[PDB]
Amino acid sequence: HLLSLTRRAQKHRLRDLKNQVKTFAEKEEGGDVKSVCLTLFLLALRAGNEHRQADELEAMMQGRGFGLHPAVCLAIRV
DNA sequence: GATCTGGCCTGTCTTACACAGTGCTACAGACTGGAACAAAAACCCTGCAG
Numbered sequence: 001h002l003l004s005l006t007r008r009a010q011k012h013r014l015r016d017l018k019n020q021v022k023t024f025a026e027k028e029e030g031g032d033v034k035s036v037c038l039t040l041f042l043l044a045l046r047a048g049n050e051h052r053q054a055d056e057l058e059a060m061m062q063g064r065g066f067g068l069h070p071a072v073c074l075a076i077r078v
Numbered sequence: 079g080a081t082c083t084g085g086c087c088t089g090t091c092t093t094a095c096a097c098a099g100t101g102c103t104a105c106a107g108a109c110t111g112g113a114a115c116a117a118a119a120a121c122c123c124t125g126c127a128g
């Protein structure tokens with residue numbers, strides 16, 4: 001399987017689709033491969049009704065808050 | 079010692095006050111796949127405009 005292998009064999013196996021995404025992203029988005037594979041990951045996770053992992057991902061990619069503002073904290077407290 | 083009466087009893091009537099909050103669970107409410115749609119957003123592109 002692809003998930004247990006090292007990065008050498010993973011990239012060796014996937015280089016075809018890696019350069020496919022490379023050329024398609026330089027075609028459409030103008031030098032943005034990272035956001036292209038991000039939108040691909042989001043669509044592949046939402047098609048399977050696993051919205052939770054997509055929400056965690058979006059909370060990692062410039063996520064609003066690791067920690068909370070003291071205000072809403074006091075709110076929850078009371 | 080009757081008489082009448084101020085006042086007291088009792089019965090009834092009216093407005094008030096604690097009865098949350100806690101686990102279970104079912105339901106409706108939200109999310110998607112192809113087809114296909116219309117309706118606007120904003121540049122570009124042209125005209126009819128002086």
Ligand SMILES: [Ca+2]
Nearest residue numbers: 093094095096
């Ligand atoms: Ca009351």
